[PDB]
Write a protein that binds this ligand. Structure first.
Ligand SMILES: [Zn+2]
Length: 43
């Protein structure tokens, strides 16, 4: 798919499977859901 598409919604989490209408909405999820320090972070 190339630039130009009816209706926004082209942001899907890379780590997990999800969708977000806005970019800001996704970014947050990525952090909250997948905190920068979660994997090696025992807790
Ligand atoms: Zn995610």
């Amino acid at each position: 798919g190339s630039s130009g598409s009816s209706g926004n919604g082209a942001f899907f989490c890379n780590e997990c499977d999800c969708r977000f209408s806005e970019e800001a909405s996704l970014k947050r999820h990525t952090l909250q859901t997948h905190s920068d320090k979660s994997g090696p972070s025992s807790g």
